[PDB]
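#struct-pred
JK: can someone run the complex with N32? inputs below
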Amino acid sequence: LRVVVTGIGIVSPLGCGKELVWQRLIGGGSGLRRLGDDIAGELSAKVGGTVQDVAEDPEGGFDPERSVPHKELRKMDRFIQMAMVAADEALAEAGWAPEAEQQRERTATVVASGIGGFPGLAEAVRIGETRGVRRLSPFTIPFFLSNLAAGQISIKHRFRGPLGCPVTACAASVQAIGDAMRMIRTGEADVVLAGGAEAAFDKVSLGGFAAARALSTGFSEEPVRASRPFDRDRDGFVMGEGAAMVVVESLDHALARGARPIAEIIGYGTTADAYHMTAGPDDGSGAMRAMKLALRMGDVAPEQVDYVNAHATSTPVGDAGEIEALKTVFGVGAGPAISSTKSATGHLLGAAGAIEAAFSILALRDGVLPGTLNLEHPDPAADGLDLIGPAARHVPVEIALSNGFGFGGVNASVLFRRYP
Amino acid sequence: SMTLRVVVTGIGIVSPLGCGKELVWQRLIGGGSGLRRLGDDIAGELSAKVGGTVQDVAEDPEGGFDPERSVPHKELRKMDRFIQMAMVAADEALAEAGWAPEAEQQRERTATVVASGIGGFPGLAEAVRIGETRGVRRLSPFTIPFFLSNLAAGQISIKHRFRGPLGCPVTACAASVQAIGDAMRMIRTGEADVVLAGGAEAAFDKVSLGGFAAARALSTGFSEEPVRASRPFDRDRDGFVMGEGAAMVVVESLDHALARGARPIAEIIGYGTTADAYHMTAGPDDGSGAMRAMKLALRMGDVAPEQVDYVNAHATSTPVGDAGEIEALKTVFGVGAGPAISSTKSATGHLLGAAGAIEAAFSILALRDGVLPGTLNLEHPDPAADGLDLIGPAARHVPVEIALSNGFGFGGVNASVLFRRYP
Ligand SMILES: C=C1C[C@@]23C=CC(=O)[C@@](C)(CCC(=O)Nc4c(O)ccc(C(=O)O)c4O)[C@@H]2C[C@@H]1CC3
Ligand SMILES: C=C1C[C@@]23C=CC(=O)[C@@](C)(CCC(=O)Nc4c(O)ccc(C(=O)O)c4O)[C@@H]2C[C@@H]1CC3
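RT: done, structure tokens with the ligand placed:
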């Protein structure tokens, strides 16, 4: 059964609204900024991809009151608020707003997060250390539970089909899209609102990644330079926040209702390294297998892939592993054009898969491949791979692959074809 | 292939009634309870004083929890308690199944799908307290993977070299019902041959308990008589009793099991999942989303309601929750006949994200042995349940062929899984 995407929503460090975000991305913009001392004061990691408010970004700022009434915001952590805005955008684009119970019952909501409501949870613990646990809000638990992103979206829109919340670290929202497609094919839903949401900035979460030496520290005075996937001087990832959503349905379902497919989902693959808890193997074998499964599903040879949106987070070991995986799948000398948009957005963690899927889809729609900012001295291990430098590449393309990996050895890859 | 019959070939349990499914089963069927007074470090400030706790080998010599049996002592520092329980339950299930592939051909066809509701809450809470006292610069390098929900499946995969899909559904108290449904789905789509599926939860902390107490969801009226506090369907229920544990099943096609000589313990014939889109912490009074999930599982199994012998209800002992499920059961099954219904949360407490997997295991064992667990504490059944065959405290010894198990959660999540006895 053929499956398509009919709507996209984005809340990100480059703004809210996918057209504006796309225009900013291709123009070389960056969402990386110095973090507040309340988050980063104790740490050497001083830079993050932050979502700005309307006062800071009048055109593209985040105002969750447009999707959630003021008095309801108290009931949901930031990631959920972001999820609600991104979902509204994707649904409006897809024109999916079912009033009838039949259609509502056939709409699923599958929204990933990596860490979920960390700020809410941290605040509850801090209350426990101060005012006392007898003073916790009645909303404490659903405020931070990961599945209340999907939950609040479903309540608002009356989506009464399956609910999902994959929490598979930084691959989670790639899996959300694969899980959406799988449900369309098994007949368990007719439309899926799928994606990811993450808003985990807090001294403790940042501190936890810091303690693992996973975060960039050497570019604090030049924040836009800090995220440099594939570059010789990369020194760890830059945490980001945001949310991105896609509306997924069968091609036949889309065309019957007059919805324009934006792109087709033709492949999905997911695997486990079973290697180490926080690093993948140097040979990239788990990631390699995930990519090959998505290509097999799409019946696409490696030489037919035009564009790869790599997971590459700007870690030394992580980017090297993905380089090796890509060489195994595609060879050297020819192959796909490859970039990492984490160079501009930072690492949206459990929302990274969905935002990069969205960029992969827009790349196909527009024949514009995002560049990799800061790619000044490519890792020599990547010689023979067509890594896109800072300039976006304007070229008609048909097939795009997007990767997402996470702690716990999770690899996921999703493959798209241009429509028509 | 979508027409594959799917079976369970091994089961593992870590619970408030012990570790090891056979011992746990014998203790459950004998009317045992895992409910105990919590430590003051957890519940000292709160009026919810009772929990289903997992005991160590000093406290329970035959059935105690010793994670060093599964994980070297040095490595325990790297994993929160929910993961340690997951590891022990997974080892049990895998040993019973005889699934320990050494070749990549089989390793690549083994998935690992382990739910949690809250994940490493004690780990996360400790990191935050460290942050307030000693400073975030003192955090362990293992802080993040210590608590991430998916590191339960992750650590299991690493130990056993399972290289197929990893899953971690975090859909609250329906989560490990969905894990089983997701496992079945993956066998039917051809994405895996064997799935280690289940749930793991160890969320006891003053803040998590405090949060549930703030939602008025916890029992507070039975502190002096802990074993009486979890009373699903009873007139005097006043909220659920939090528990901890892990349970796992090994899922594969019947054809694959027969090929390798593994004995199916039961068959998985149906799964359904729905969303209420009603309220963030309560379902509708008529249980209509639960009803729909149950009917979807029955439809998938091609089973009429009158063919169901046993229902392991979600019923957690909350006033509104159990009443909703009563109404859903009446809609699906009618009144006057219908299945025998019990809730084993009466004995184990609510294992949250691991409730689905443990209750699945009990439903499977019920079919295997022809013994339906009772509902402890059911002294004055809610009148709304008149017409439903609620099992009282005594386990019922009767041959049975079909069992349904429900799991629901905050955010309007409903899931149901349906089993048939094997052969
Ligand atoms: C075992 C080691 C060696 C060490 C050395 C160099 C590194 O690059 C890091 C810092 C990160 C590895 C990595 O990219 N993991 C890694 C991964 O497997 C999957 C995903 C991500 C992600 O960001 O999405 C990720 O970050 C590792 C982690 C830990 C300590 C230092
Ligand atoms: C909206 C209300 C009314 C209120 C009144 C009586 C109740 O019984 C509770 C306390 C819990 C309802 C419930 O069982 N939710 C509920 C649910 O939907 C799904 C799962 C569970 C679970 O334990 O697994 C659950 O607990 C609710 C919660 C909140 C405040 C008081």
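RT: quick notes.
Chain B touches chain A through 81 residues (CB under 8 Å).
Residues 81-97 of chain B form the longest helix (17 residues).
JK: thanks, will look after standup
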